[PDB]
């Protein structure tokens, strides 16, 4: 099963339109550390909801 | 659940012991046969001197089934083997005068009053 006519750049772009990326809606800030981390995840130092775990 | 090519024992004393079912009566695409369902069988193993011989083709009724019957309350009554009773192609009446083993109450009808009476036990 192979193609019979060469597709176009328009069709290629239409197909790739749904292949885009979605960025992060917003970031979270720790109450005491003031950093920026992902939602429900820990920071790069070991802070989560103000407490220290590392 | 009796179908074609199924091997059955014989409950009556007409001279047969092993029979092979070839058709199931009742309609089109009829494949399963329970108790009280008329089927057609051929004779594969028969006694030397009996009312029938080997190779005869005739109707029969099912009195015992390994699959078993199902009462309305859910009580299922099964057996350890599949046995049938021979009949006549025209009159559909039993040939032998005895019925070996027990039978089920889901068999009694105006056509089979001569089987339950001869059976020593009815369930």
């Amino acid at each position: 099963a192979v193609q019979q006519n060469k597709p176009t750049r328009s069709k290629r772009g239409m197909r790739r339109s749904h292949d885009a990326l979605t960025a992060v809606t917003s970031l979270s800030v720790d109450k005491t550390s003031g950093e920026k981390h992902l939602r429900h995840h820990i920071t790069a130092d070991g802070y989560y909801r103000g407490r220290k775990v590392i | 659940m009796i179908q074609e090519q199924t091997m059955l024992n014989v409950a009556d004393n007409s001279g047969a012991r092993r029979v092979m079912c070839i058709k199931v009566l009742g309609g089109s695409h009829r494949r399963y046969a329970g108790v009280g369902d008329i089927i057609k069988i051929t004779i594969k193993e028969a006694i030397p001197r009996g009312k029938v011989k080997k190779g005869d083709v005739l109707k029969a009724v099912v009195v015992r089934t390994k699959k078993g019957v199902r009462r309305p309350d859910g009580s299922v009554i099964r057996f350890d083997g599949n046995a049938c009773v021979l009949l006549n192609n025209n009159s559909e009446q039993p040939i032998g005068t005895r019925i070996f083993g027990p039978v089920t109450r889901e068999l009694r009808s105006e056509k089979f009053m001569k089987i339950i009476s001869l059976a020593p036990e009815v369930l």
């Binding site: 992902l38 429900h40 995840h41 820990i42 989560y48 775990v53 | -």
Partner: protein, 119 residues
């Protein structure tokens, strides 16, 4: 299909999944905190928390069953000595899952699973 079922294959057979979970539970008991993928950290709770409730009642049969499950005397001894009285007041909840982020080699989610009474 998968309806009302439980358990996760994790692209492994039973003989591998049981051994991996046993090793992970032993490491978690030994270190009080480990880092692993989120599904593994979630499925390890169902193996470790019953194992802690078993140690909550000290006896010979319980220790024998724990040894059958873990194959580590140095782990079962600690489980029956320290974790037992430590979690004797908690009605479950012997683990705490904190998301770590992702990974470089496969970009899989990562998380730290530890004991609630660690620090």
């Amino acid at each position: 299909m998968r309806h009302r079922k439980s358990g996760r294959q994790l692209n492994r057979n039973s003989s591998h999944r049981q051994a991996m979970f046993r090793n992970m539970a032993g490491s978690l008991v030994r270190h009080e905190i480990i880092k692993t993928t989120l599904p593994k950290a979630k499925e390890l709770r169902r193996v470790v928390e019953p194992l802690i409730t078993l140690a909550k009642t000290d006896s010979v049969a319980n220790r024998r069953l724990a040894f059958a499950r873990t194959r580590d005397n140095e782990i079962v001894a600690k489980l029956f000595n320290e974790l037992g009285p430590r979690f004797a007041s908690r009605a479950g909840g012997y683990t705490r899952i904190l998301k770590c982020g992702f990974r470089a080699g496969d970009n899989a989610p990562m998380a730290y699973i530890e004991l609630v009474d660690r620090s």
